[PDB]
Amino acid sequence: STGSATTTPIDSLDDAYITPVQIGTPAQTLNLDFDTGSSDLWVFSSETTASEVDGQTIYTPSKSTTAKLLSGATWSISYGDGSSSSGDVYTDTVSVGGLTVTGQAVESAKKVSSSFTEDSTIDGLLGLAFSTLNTVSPTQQKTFFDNAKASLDSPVFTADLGYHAPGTYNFGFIDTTAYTGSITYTAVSTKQGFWEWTSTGYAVGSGTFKSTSIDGIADTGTTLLYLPATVVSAYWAQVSGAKSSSSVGGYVFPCSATLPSFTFGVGSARIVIPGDYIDFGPISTGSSSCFGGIQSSAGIGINIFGDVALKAAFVVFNGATTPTLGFASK
Numbered sequence: 312s313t314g315s316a317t318t319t320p321i322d323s324l325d326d327a328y329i330t331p332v333q334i335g336t337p338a339q340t341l342n343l344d345f346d347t348g349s350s351d352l353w354v355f356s357s358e359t360t361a362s363e364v365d366g367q368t369i370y371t372p373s374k375s376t377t378a379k380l381l382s383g384a385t386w387s388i389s390y391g392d393g394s395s396s397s398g399d400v401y402t403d404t405v406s407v408g409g410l411t412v413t414g415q416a417v418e419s420a421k422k423v424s425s426s427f428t429e430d431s432t433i434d435g436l437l438g439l440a441f442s443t444l445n446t447v448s449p450t451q452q453k454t455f456f457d458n459a460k461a462s463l464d465s466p467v468f469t470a471d472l473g474y475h476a477p478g479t480y481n482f483g484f485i486d487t488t489a490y491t492g493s494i495t496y497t498a499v500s501t502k503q504g505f506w507e508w509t510s511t512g513y514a515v516g517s518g519t520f521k522s523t524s525i526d527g528i529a530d531t532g533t534t535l536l537y538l539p540a541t542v543v544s545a546y547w548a549q550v551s552g553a554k555s556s557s558s559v560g561g562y563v564f565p566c567s568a569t570l571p572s573f574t575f576g577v578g579s580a581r582i583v584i585p586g587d588y589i590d591f592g593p594i595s596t597g598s599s600s601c602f603g604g605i606q607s608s609a610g611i612g613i614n615i616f617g618d619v620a621l622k623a624a625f626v627v628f629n630g631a632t633t634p635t636l637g638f639a640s641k
Contacts, residue, residue, distance in 0.1 A: 312462045313483035314410025318345065318472065321432040324591050325618060326534050328472060329433060330480055333406040334417055335375030341368050341434035345480055346532030347470070347506055347628065348615075350444035350454050351388055352405070353396060353418035354435035355427075363423050366431030372419065378403045386418045386447045391533070391611065396423040400447055405455060407437075410482050412459050416445075416452035436532070439468065439628065444504035456482070456630060466630040470531055471641070472622035474588055490625035490639035495580035499634045503613075505530070506628060508636050510616075511578060513538075515546050516571030520581070527614030529621060529628070529636055535591070536573070536584070537608035537615040546573060546605050553603070559594050562603040566593060573605060575620060577638040584623040 318330040329342040334354065341354055355364060357371040372378035378401045387397035398421035405415040420435070427433065438445070442453045460466045463483035471489055472478040479489070500507045505528040512522040525538065543562065547553040549571050553564035564570070570586030589604035604619040627637030 312410055312459070313464055313481070314406075314408035314459075315479060315481050316408030317477050318480050319477045320473065320475065321430070323475070325472075325475060325622065327433065328478070328531070328618070330407070330437070332437060334370055335372070335403050336377040337375075338406070339368075339370055339375065341370060342432065343435050343437040344433050344532060345437050345439055345470075346530070347439040348528060348530035348532045349388065349390065349436060350438040350440045350442055350504065351386060351418050351446055352416065352435070352437045352455055353386065353388070353398070353420055355423070356398070356419040358398060359420045360422055363428045365428050368434045370417065370419065370435075372401045372403065372417075375403055377413075378417075381416065381447075381450075384416075384447050384450060384452075388446045391615075392426070394424045394426040396420050396427060398422065400452070407455065407482065408480070410459060410463075412455055415455055415458055416447060418447065439531070440506065441501050441504045443501070456628075459483075460630055468628050468630070470621060470626045470628065472531070472618055474585075474622050478622070485627060490641040492640055493580075494625070494627055494637040494639040495577045496627070496629070496635045496637045497577050499636050501634060503528075505613075506634070506636055511576030513542055513576065514574040514581075515549050516586075518549075520574065520576070522576075525575075525614055527608075527616050529616050529626060531618065531621060533615045533617030534619070535615075535617050536589075536605045536619040537611055537617065538605065539614065540607045540609045543605055543607045546571075547603065555607075559600075559602070561606045563594060563600045564603055566599045566601040568601075575616075580638065582620070582624045582638055582640060584620060588619055588623060
């Protein structure tokens with residue numbers, strides 16, 4: 312089997328991407344944030360504290376003839392940006408782009424933190440990291456990909472995120488028309504439960520390539536590119552007027568600037584992030600100070616190849632016995 316679904320930016324800045332997901336019988340379609348940095352599939356639901364729902368589409372398991380309460384199971388998660396959610400668990404039928412999993416754990420939110428409530432466009436998350444990170448207790452549950460894997464034509468999924476445009480998540484096949492040149496594959500460590508890999512270095516604009524190992528995670532659920540302070544300083548030094556602002560919470564730059572590109576290494580190959588991808592607009596409405604898309608990972612504890620990086624590439628998440636990551640230009 313295979314599946315193919317379109318993923319769409321939630322706003323004009325590409326702050327996140329939503330992908331429609333069918334849950335239950337008859338289908339209830341929810342728009343979920345596919346997140347290769349976590350491993351829970353959770354949804355706004357009929358059980359969510361009413362004051363914490365503001366415009367989201369909810370899953371109502373009592374209206375699904377295939378929903379079954381997973382007795383005794385609870386879940387609770389906290390994300391790197393400080394947001395959180397928790398609740399109980401159903402199993403139900405879940406389909407993505409024509410690909411169907413029966414008995415998928417659907418984690419029903421009783422509580423969500425304010426940032427989720429305030430984002431009316433995201434109805435929940437669909438985790439695509441390794442199932443070892445799944446928070447369901449006392450019996451850990453598998454991700455959608457993990458459940459689908461054995462049935463897929465090939466045990467892979469691909470992320471093809473658009474810049475200010477729709478893109479595609481495919482399951483079970485590699486669309487050879489969706490990228491240019493060849494796919495370069497690179498080793499993955501699953502030791503922390505993430506799609507963790509080591510970039511071979513970077514360049515700023517038309518500058519020379521610096522060969523240096525950068526360990527980080529491929530994370531579709533993080534907006535920006537978070538890299539070591541040395542790398543990030545080298546980038547923003549090429550933008551007149553750019554500075555790190557403690558009060559804003561990162562590097563800002565004059566909105567009148569032209570940003571240089573940023574290149575990262577995948578083995579001997581190179582992925583180029585155009586300067587425009589690194590512009591996240593005014594820090595506040597009407598400001599001429601703009602927020603940067605490359606930020607320091609210092610104090611995160613891990614480097615994160617988030618959407619800013621990933622949307623510059625066609626990315627293969629290879630879930631073979633020994634997982635690997637593939638990157639192609641497009």
